[PDB]
């Protein structure tokens, strides 16, 4: 794809998920789109980093692996295609010009409205040698939440792949042991998924109680 | 001890030396079986790590 990545479609003015407190304002339809591919002249060293990545990777392989490049707020995010993640990770880590020796972790985020790409894993990579920073974004469907584990390339991803599996169910296949790290192994569900309820209890008060914030109204 | 039995007293030193030698020879493991130090165990390829 080439259009910006719509993650949610909000209907109605005032950011109201429900029908609307006032009649007549619920007809606005605004898709919430995360930024799409950036025009080629990336700012700063991002342009050099992508030039080197496209040089080390073959043109065919580069096209197959890099789904998108997003330069947002002077930060570079390579939407990498799944499956190819280990290859590009190895290239980034090992290549002298890229040399992103320090992978800082793996963060899971869930986009239940993003069809075919509900689960995203974010790999913040830093190159101390060149003092550079990038992020890799890998998308997996909710129905097939598998992603190639970067354990061979970045051992630090262990306990980050485990944590993101625990909180989102992303199956980092190839991981030495993808067991729950935060939740009990007996736990049911993956808490940080949006569909997973907050699980709070009403706050008690003399003569009343306040339900958890997830049950009550909101205007996100 | 030091007049009538000084000879036995001195030989007790030989007993002690033999005990120490036996302990060292039979029980003291040498360099070839020295357990790897934490420093040594922390570097193997990338020790536990990777």
The DSSP letter of residue A202 is: P
Instruction: Report whether A161 contacts A149 (CB < 8 A).
Output: yes
The β-bridge partners of A204 are: A209
Instruction: Report whether A213 contacts A220 (CB < 8 A).
Output: no
DSSP A44-102: TTHHHHHHHHHHHS-HHHHHHHEEEEEEETTEEEEEEPTTSHHHHHHHHHH-TTT---E
Antiparallel, parallel or unpaired: β A171-173 and A146-148: parallel
CB contacts < 8 A, A to B, total 3
Method for structure elucidation: cryo-EM
Contacts by A89-97, CB closer than 8 A, 24 or more apart: A89/A123, A89/A136, A89/A150, A89/A153, A89/A154, A90/A153, A91/A53, A91/A56, A91/A57, A92/A53, A92/A125, A92/A134, A93/A153, A93/A154, A95/A52, A95/A56, A97/A52, A97/A56, A97/A130
Which chain A residues touch B49 with a CB distance below 8 Å?
155
Tokens describing residue A191: 């808490």
Instruction: Report whether A123 contacts A138 (CB < 8 A).
Output: yes
Q: Which of A206, A55, A59, A34 is nearest to A122 (CA)?
A: A34
* Cα diameter, chain A: 69
- Those residues whose C-beta lies under 8 Å from the C-beta of residue A201, and which sit 6 or more positions away, are A212
Which chain A residues touch B46 with a CB distance below 8 Å?
155
Interface of B with A (CB under 8 A): 46, 49-50
Please state, in angstroms and rounded to a whole number, the distance separating the CA atoms of residues A174 and A155: 12
Instruction: Report whether A120 contacts A109 (CB < 8 A).
Output: yes
Tokens describing residue A61: 């392989």
Please state, in angstroms and rounded to a whole number, the distance separating the CA atoms of residues A3 and A35: 9
The DSSP letter of residue B43 is: T
Instruction: Report whether A93 contacts A140 (CB < 8 A).
Output: no
Residue of A nearest to B46 (CA): A155
Interface of A with B in 85-114 (CB under 8 A): none
Which chain A residues touch B44 with a CB distance below 8 Å?
none
Tokens describing residue A60: 């065919």
Residue pointed to by tokens 């919430």: A32
Whether the CB of A176 is below 8 Å from some CB of chain B: the reply is no
Angle A85-94/A46-56 helices, nearest 10 degrees? 110
Please state, in angstroms and rounded to a whole number, the distance separating the CA atoms of residues A16 and A190: 26
Instruction: Report whether A123 contacts A89 (CB < 8 A).
Output: yes
Q: Which of A115, A197, A135, A121 is nearest to A164 (CA)?
A: A121
Tokens describing residue B10: 């001195």
Min CA distance, B38 vs chain A (Å)? 20
Beta strands in chain A (DSSP E): 5-11, 29-34, 66-72, 75-80, 102-103, 107-110, 119-127, 132-140, 146-148, 171-173, 203-205, 208-210
The β-bridge partners of A77 are: A70, A135
Within 10 Å of residue B25's Cβ, how many Cβ atoms? Answer: 8
**Given in angstroms, what resolution was this structure solved at?**
2.7
Which chain B residues touch A155 with a CB distance below 8 Å?
46, 49-50
Q: How far, CA to CA in Å, does A194 sit from each of A35, A48, A167?
A: 21, 37, 10
């Amino acid at each position: 794809g080439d259009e910006p990545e719509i993650i949610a479609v909000r209907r109605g003015m005032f950011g109201n998920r429900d029908t609307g407190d006032t009649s007549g304002y619920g007809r606005l339809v605004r898709p919430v789109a995360l930024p799409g591919s950036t025009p080629r002249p990336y700012g700063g060293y991002f342009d050099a980093v992508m030039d080197r990545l496209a040089e080390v990777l073959g043109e065919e392989r580069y096209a197959m692996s890099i789904e998108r490049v997003v330069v947002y707020r002077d930060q570079l995010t390579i939407e990498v295609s799944r499956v190819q993640l280990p290859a590009v990770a190895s290239v980034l880590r090992d290549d002298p010009d890229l040399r992103f020796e320090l992978c800082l972790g793996v963060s899971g985020v869930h986009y239940p409205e993003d069809t075919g790409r509900e689960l995203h894993a974010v790999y913040p990579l830093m190159s101390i040698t060149h003092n550079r920073r990038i992020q890799l974004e890998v998308a997996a469907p909710d129905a097939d939440p598998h992603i190639p584990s970067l354990y061979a390339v970045y051992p630090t991803t262990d306990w980050h792949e485990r944590e993101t599996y625990d909180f989102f169910g992303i199956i980092f296949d190839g991981h030495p042991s993808l067991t729950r790290i935060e939740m009990p192994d007996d736990w049911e569900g993956h808490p940080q998924r949006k569909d997973y309820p907050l699980g709070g209890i009403p706050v008690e008060y003399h003569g009343a109680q306040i339900p958890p914030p997830d049950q009550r109204r909101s205007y996100s | 001890i030091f007049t009538r039995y000084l000879w036995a007293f001195e030989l007790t030193s030989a007993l002690l030396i033999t005990a120490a030698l036996g302990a060292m020879v039979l029980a003291h493991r040498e360099r070839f079986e020295r357990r790897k130090t934490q420093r040594e165990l922390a570097i193997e390829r990338f020790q536990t790590g990777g």
